[PDB]
From a paper:
Human multidrug resistance protein 5 (hMRP5) effluxes anticancer and antivirus drugs, driving multidrug resistance. To uncover the mechanism of hMRP5, we determine six distinct cryo-EM structures, revealing an autoinhibitory N-terminal peptide that must dissociate to permit subsequent substrate recruitment. Human MRP5 was demonstrated to play a critical function in regulating cellular cyclic GMP (cGMP) homeostasis, which is essential for many physiological processes, including the maintenance of vascular smooth muscle tone and cardiac contractility. hMRP5 also influences signaling transduction pathways and may contribute to drug resistance in anticancer and antivirus therapy. From a clinical oncology perspective, hMRP5 can directly contribute to cancer drug resistance through the efflux of many anticancer drugs, such as methotrexate, cisplatin, purine analogs, pyrimidine analogs, doxorubicin, and antifolates from cells.
The following single-particle reconstruction with cryoSPARC36 yielded a 2.9 Å hMRP5 map. Overall, hMRP5 displayed features typical of a nucleotide-free inward-open conformation; its height and width were ~140 Å and ~95 Å, respectively. In addition to those of the well-solved transmembrane and NBD regions, an unexpected EM density was discovered in the central cavity of the TMDs near the cytosolic leaflet. This unassigned density was peptide-sized and -shaped. Based on the features of the auto-blocked EM density and the Met1-Thr94 peptide side chains, we were able to build an atomic model of the peptide trapped in the hMRP5 binding pocket (see more details in the method session). This peptide spanning from Cys46 to Ser64, referred to as C46-S64, was well fitted into the EM density. In the pocket, C46-S64 adopted a coiled, serpentine structure with its side chains facing the cytosol. The first group consisted of hydrophobic amino acids, including Trp240 (TM2), Tyr244 (TM2), Phe288 (TM3), Val293 (TM3), Phe452 (TM6), Phe988 (TM9), Met992 (TM9), Phe1091 (TM11), and Phe1145 (TM12), which applied hydrophobic forces on the peptide. The second interaction group was composed of charged residues, including Arg286 (TM3), Glu289 (TM3), Arg344 (TM4), Lys448 (TM6), Lys455 (TM6), Arg985 (TM9), Lys1040 (TM10), Arg1096 (TM11), Arg1148 (TM12) and Glu1152 (TM12). Notably, mass spectrometry analysis of purified wt-hMRP5 verified Ser60 is phosphorylated (P-Ser60), allowing P-Ser60 to contact Arg1040 and Arg1148 through charge interactions. Accordingly, Glu289, Lys1040, and Arg1096 may form salt bridges with Arg55, P-Ser60, and Glu57 of the C46-S64 peptide, respectively.
Numbering used by the authors:
A (entry chain A): 94 to 501, 573 to 786, 840 to 1437
B (entry chain B): 46 to 64
The structure:
């Protein structure tokens, strides 16, 4: 942003309606290859936020004081705001519509009726071509001027309304009345709604008028049969409305289907380790397949209706023409080339305007909704700030028998408040929860209303909230909080709040960016930073509501003594606390009880009085390459599918072309040399009604229309099927590769990225790519068919076209290097805007207490203008490209007309009419082509990401090992032996298993206990072969697991995870998703784990719905279900991993004894750290950073003082005994 | 969602994203 005056201000009418200043910017962008924020121009003074906000606020205030705030119309105010510019836009749009109608109708009618004449006049035909050229130029440039006015009007409206919304938001009493996302959307998206509304509705009020003009003109030309063409549009456009409604209806159900699929995919990715060690890959694969097929069916329906409503404008023209001319000629009327093709051209113009209109209606509807939301915002109750000064300056806060009430209506919580605070008196607030302390704080701040009495106040406020709002900036910026910098005072403040450890831990503490709520900081550090901000702010009154609650007692007391009893001895401090041991040194103590003042005074007086304050006192003491397109085509079915789809596209467009050509051919035939009686003499009469074969031509015309409709339906169905097949192939291959990659992938890659590939990359391909691809291919084939028709009539049209192809290529290059670099600048400047919005809305109370409601508004305005400049340039660049492509189209039509008039007598009038109709049809198709090409390129970037992941993922071990099945009874016993065990999770990482060797006899209860990182967590990983060994071997009963298949290895081992893993579905699904056991076995397992009574009591005992993670049972019930699932397998060796996590005592004993008795005959590998639980087992194994030092019975280890296990047992006993 | 009639009029000079 750098300018003196914006180039739009120094632009004449020609530059405004051709956008030559943006041509200069486009030249700069193309030469550089990219744009920076310094290459764009700053907002004009006219579109600045402040002046427009002032205008809008004045207009709203006049409405409020004329009608009142219960019958006020913000729509009226927005109208009056935009009125003059909207009127100018409507005038220019009327000019555009008049020119667009006058060109085809009058110009083509006279041009074609000149070709039907017998004598050639060269000074009249050229005048007709000149008129056509001038009319096309006028309509193009008037539409450009309309868009230019609308863009500035919308930008001004957006800026003004967003600034007004933030102004209101910064002074809201009930901050939590509206939501936080709602308040964000008020300042973020509603402005875009208003901008789009302004521009596109200003377009709206020009659409139906040219349709009426065309209907009247068709009636004038033909007779009562023009109403036939008129009624086609009337019946047709509501049909496309209904198609849109149906597509939306089906896409609403597709949302639920996709949500279910993504939820299951999240379950698969989050607990992939559990699925691998349980060999449960197939069940989740089948469930995802079922959800995917139902989603695919819904997608098929939605895509069918979408394709139904894609490319109907030539279809409208052809249907209207067929009905009109068939019923015209079957009733015995007469028709010529001029009349028929003038009517066709008028149909084309009507379709153009009606293509414009519907989205305008939609935009105005969304505008009405947004204006309703804005009016709801602007009428909310505002927060005040008490200004009634006290009598004596010595008093800073003073009330008098006041009774204040909350607002939710008045909710009374304060009664007869007699409060007087003198300067320098540190006051403390005491009481119970809800006594009215925060109510007092809010009343002093200015959020409450007065009923009786008076409130006095003097001075400025600092504020440390209980949540410690942290500003989204650097740690030094949010300690100044808009204040000037000083070295010694800042250092003293930092030393006062104990920030030096914080300065040491953070990498660039004094310059570290902090999140809106706190990303790498703790609650105590947040409190310390808020306190530092308060002390630096240096105000007269301090409101510290529970500033040291989350803080530790030691550091809390340290800060209290070092700052509150030292720094603020000369200022007023409002200390609100729940820890009442701090008020022994306070100057004055205040106790609140049920909103009524009962006892206060000095600490010794409170001790002497033995009041309720004493009772609580004693209690506390106790761009993509061709490769991506080739990959997508191969996924769709290969070259054959592409050829079939292209063939059907060409068949549809050529059916429309054949309908038009058949009209031309039927007109060209004439009467076919028939002599008829017209009186006393007979002679040849050239009239299409005298053709003996006229009914044949009419029948073929109707057949052409029907065949075009059938081909459109077939094309839609086949395209939807092929695109969804491609997307399904991509999804299936990606899922297959995901379910078969080692845990190294899931460890080095966040699950968020993989879900993103599944969640939004799949959604993007599925819905978006077929839609944009269909629109692009339809438009390109239509352009090719129009050019081919005009060329089959005139090859020198191709001669002229060539250079225009070069110009189109140049335009596409320049308008693609510019529009893409303005799109990025638009959203780069939006990130600070949204961050500021969120940070401000999350800290409104602190902003209001600090009286910083204008600095944040100024920053909001600055960020809004920074965002608004590139967005304005972006829209104007859209219209710049549109103007130049319109120039190319105008050149095409002018060339066609010149050829029509230079070949008078050599071309039949019907073929000339056909050519001119297609030349006019060529209008407006180039901008759509360019924009759709860019959109499909983006969708294929998404496909590029998906295929990158598809061809990137590595391979796990094969499901079956060639070394063959070990045995049909393996393991026969539970003897496991280790020797020279080497294991490492990844490459270059230190080994976690360093020459570990031990033997375990069957039925032994072995409790693995050790320090963190000793390798306790790798026994299960190496036993299940999740990570291959780097040395040594693992042997069970003389069988080396290195030569047994993964399925045959994991099928005979069971593991109880540290946390309970429960998937969405039913209990039957979470207990035996393969349906391999009988009901009796399941119920015996359930009664073994004490679960039969809890399950049979449910109405759907074995079919009961299980929520995500099983948040419908208690923790004990979830653990019982997990042990039941493990027990259902009947495995000889099991790994139980530290199943203690915040559990009640008797439940812990019950689960411990249940595991003791259930697995009595199975070898137990208990991975736990609680030493007291492992006592009584057979042998105790202790690992020392990947090696075992002591391994024997606990009896011989606790009897030896030198034993390390005895040492840690003694340490644990001391930790339990000493609290202290 | 996104229609082919809304897109045709919105690809005339507006951005192709409703949200």
């Amino acid at each position: 942003t750098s300018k003196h005056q914006h180039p739009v201000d120094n632009a004449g009418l020609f530059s405004c309606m051709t956008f030559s200043w943006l041509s200069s910017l486009a030249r700069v962008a193309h030469k550089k290859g990219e744009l920076s924020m310094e290459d764009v121009w700053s907002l004009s003074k006219h579109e600045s936020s402040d002046v427009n906000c002032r205008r809008l606020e004045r207009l709203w205030q006049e409405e409020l004081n004329e009608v009142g705030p219960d019958a006020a119309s913000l729509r009226r105010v927005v109208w009056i705001f935009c009125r003059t510019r909207l009127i100018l836009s409507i005038v220019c749009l009327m000019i555009t519509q008049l020119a667009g109608f006058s060109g085809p109708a009058f110009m083509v009618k006279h041009l074609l009726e000149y070709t039907q004449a017998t004598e050639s006049n060269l000074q009249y035909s050229l005048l007709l071509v000149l008129g056509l050229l001038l009319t096309e130029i006028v309509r193009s440039w008037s539409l450009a001027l309309t868009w230019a006015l609308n863009y500035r009007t919308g930008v001004r409206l957006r800026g003004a309304i967003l600034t007004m919304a933030f102004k209101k938001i910064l002074k809201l009493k009930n901050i939590k009345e509206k939501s936080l996302g709602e308040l964000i959307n008020i300042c973020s998206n509603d402005g875009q709604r208003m901008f789009e509304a302004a521009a596109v509705g200003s377009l709206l009020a020009g659409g139906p008028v040219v349709a009426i003009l065309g209907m009247i003109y068709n009636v004038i030309i033909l007779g009562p049969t023009g109403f036939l063409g008129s009624a086609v549009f009337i019946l047709f456009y509501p049909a496309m409305m209904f198609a849109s409604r149906l597509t939306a209806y089906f896409r609403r159900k597709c949302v639920a289907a996709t949500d279910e699929r993504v939820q299951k995919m999240n379950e698969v990715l989050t607990y992939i380790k559990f699925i691998k060690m349980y060999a449960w890959v197939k069940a989740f694969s089948q469930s995802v397949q079922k959800i995917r097929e139902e989603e695919r069916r819904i997608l098929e329906k939605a895509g069918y209706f979408q394709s139904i409503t894609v490319g109907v404008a030539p279809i409208v023209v052809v249907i209207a023409s067929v009905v009109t001319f068939s019923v015209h000629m079957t009733l015995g009327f007469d028709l010529t080339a001029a009349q028929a093709f003038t009517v066709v051209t008028v149909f084309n113009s009507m379709t153009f305007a009606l293509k414009v209109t519907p989205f305008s209606v939609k935009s105005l509807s969304e505008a009405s909704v947004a204006v309703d939301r804005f009016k709801s915002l602007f009428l909310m109750e505002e927060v005040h700030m008490i200004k009634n000064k006290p009598a004596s300056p010595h008093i800073k806060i003073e009330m008098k028998n006041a009774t204040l009430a909350w607002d939710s209506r008045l909710q009374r919580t304060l009664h007869s408040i007699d409060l007087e605070i003198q300067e320098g008196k540190l006051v403390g607030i005491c009481g119970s929860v809800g006594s009215g302390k925060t109510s007092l704080i809010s009343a002093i701040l200015g959020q409450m209303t007065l009923l009786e009495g008076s409130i006095a106040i003097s001075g400025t406020f600092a504020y440390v909230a209980q949540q410690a709002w942290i500003l989204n900036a650097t740690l030094r910026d949010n300690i100044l909080f808009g204040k000037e910098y000083d070295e010694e005072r800042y250092n003293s403040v930092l030393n006062s709040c104990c920030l030096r450890p914080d300065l040491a831990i953070l990498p660039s503490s004094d310059l570290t960016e902090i999140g809106e709520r706190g990303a790498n900081l703790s609650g105590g550090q947040r409190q310390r930073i808020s306190l530092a901000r308060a002390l630096y702010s240096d105000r007269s009154i301090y409101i510290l509501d529970d500033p040291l609650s989350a803080l530790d007692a030691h550091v809390g007391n340290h800060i209290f003594n070092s700052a509150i009893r030292k720094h603020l001895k000369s200022k007023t401090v409002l200390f609100v606390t729940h820890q009442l041991q701090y008020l022994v040194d306070c100057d004055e103590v205040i106790f609140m009880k049920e909103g009524c003042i009962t006892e206060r005074g000095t600490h010794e007086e409170l001790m002497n009085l033995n009041g309720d304050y004493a009772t609580i006192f004693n209690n506390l003491l106790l761009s993509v390459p061709w490769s991506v397109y080739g990959v997508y085509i191969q996924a769709a079915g290969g070259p054959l599918a592409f050829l079939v789809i292209m063939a059907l596209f060409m068949l549809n467009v050529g059916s429309t072309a054949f309908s038009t050509w058949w009209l031309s051919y039927w007109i060209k035939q004439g009467s076919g040399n028939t002599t008829v009686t017209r009186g006393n003499e007979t002679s040849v009469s050239d009239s299409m009604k005298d053709n003996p074969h006229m009914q044949y031509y009419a029948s073929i015309y109707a057949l052409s229309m029907a065949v075009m409709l059938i081909l459109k339906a077939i094309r839609g169905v086949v395209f939807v099927k092929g695109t969804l097949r491609a997307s399904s192939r991509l999804h299936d291959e990606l899922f297959r590769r995901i379910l078969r990659s080692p845990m190294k992938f899931f460890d080095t890659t966040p699950t968020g990225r993989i879900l993103n590939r599944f969640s939004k990359d799949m959604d993007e391909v599925d819905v978006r790519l077929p839609f944009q691809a269909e629109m692009f291919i339809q438009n390109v084939i239509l352009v090719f068919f129009c050019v081919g028709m005009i060329a089959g009539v005139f090859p020198w049209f191709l001669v002229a076209v060539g250079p225009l192809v070069i110009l189109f290529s140049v335009l596409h290059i320049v308008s693609r290097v510019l529009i893409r670099e303005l799109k990025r600048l638009d959203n780069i400047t939006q990130s600070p805007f949204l961050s500021h919005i969120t940070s401000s809305i999350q800290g409104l109370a602190t902003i209001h207490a600090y009286n910083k409601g204008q600095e944040f508004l100024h920053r909001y305005q600055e960020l809004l203008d920074d965002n608004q400049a590139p967005f304005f340039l972006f829209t104007c660049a859209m219209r710049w490209l549109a103007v130049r492509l319109d120039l190319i189209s105008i050149a095409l039509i002018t060339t066609t007309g010149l050829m029509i008039v230079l070949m008078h007598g050599q071309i039949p009038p019907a073929y000339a009419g056909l050519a001119i109709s297609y030349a006019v049809q060529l209008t407006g198709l180039f901008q759509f082509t360019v924009r759709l090409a860019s959109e499909t390129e983006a969708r294929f970037t998404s496909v590029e990401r998906i295929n990158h992941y598809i061809k990137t993922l590595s391979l796990e071990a094969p499901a079956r090992i060639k070394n063959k099945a070990p045995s049909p009874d393996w393991p026969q016993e539970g003897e496991v032996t280790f020797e020279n065990a080497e294991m490492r999770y990844r490459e270059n990482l230190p080994l976690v298993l360093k020459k570990v060797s031990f033997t375990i006899k069957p039925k032994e209860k072995i409790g693995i206990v050790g320090r963190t990182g000793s390798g306790k967590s790798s026994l299960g990983m190496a036993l299940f072969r999740l990570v291959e060994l780097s040395g040594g071997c693992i042997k069970i009963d003389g069988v080396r697991i290195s030569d047994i298949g993964l399925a045959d290895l994991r099928s005979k081992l069971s593991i109880i995870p540290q946390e309970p893993v429960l998937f969405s579905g039913t209990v039957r699904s979470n207990l035996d998703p393969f349906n391999q056991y009988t009901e009796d076995q399941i119920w015996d397992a359930l009664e073994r784990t004490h679960m039969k009574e809890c399950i049979a009591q449910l109405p759907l005992k074995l079919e009961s719905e299980v929520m995500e993670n099983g948040d419908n049972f208690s923790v004990g019930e979830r653990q019982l279900l997990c042990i039941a699932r493990a027990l259902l397998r009947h495995c000889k060796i099991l790994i139980l991993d530290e199943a203690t996590a915040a559990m009640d005592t008797e439940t812990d004993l019950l689960i411990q004894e249940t595991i003791r008795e259930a697995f009595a005959d199975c070898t137990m590998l208990t991975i736990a750290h609680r030493l007291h639980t492992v006592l009584g087992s057979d042998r105790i194994m202790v690992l020392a950073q990947g090696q075992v030092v002591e391994f024997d019975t606990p009896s011989v280890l606790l009897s030896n003082d030198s034993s390390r296990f005895y040492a840690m047992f003694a340490a644990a006993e001391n930790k339990v005994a000493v609290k202290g | 969602c996104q229609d082919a009639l809304e897109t045709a009029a919105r690809a005339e000079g507006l951005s192709l994203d409703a949200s």
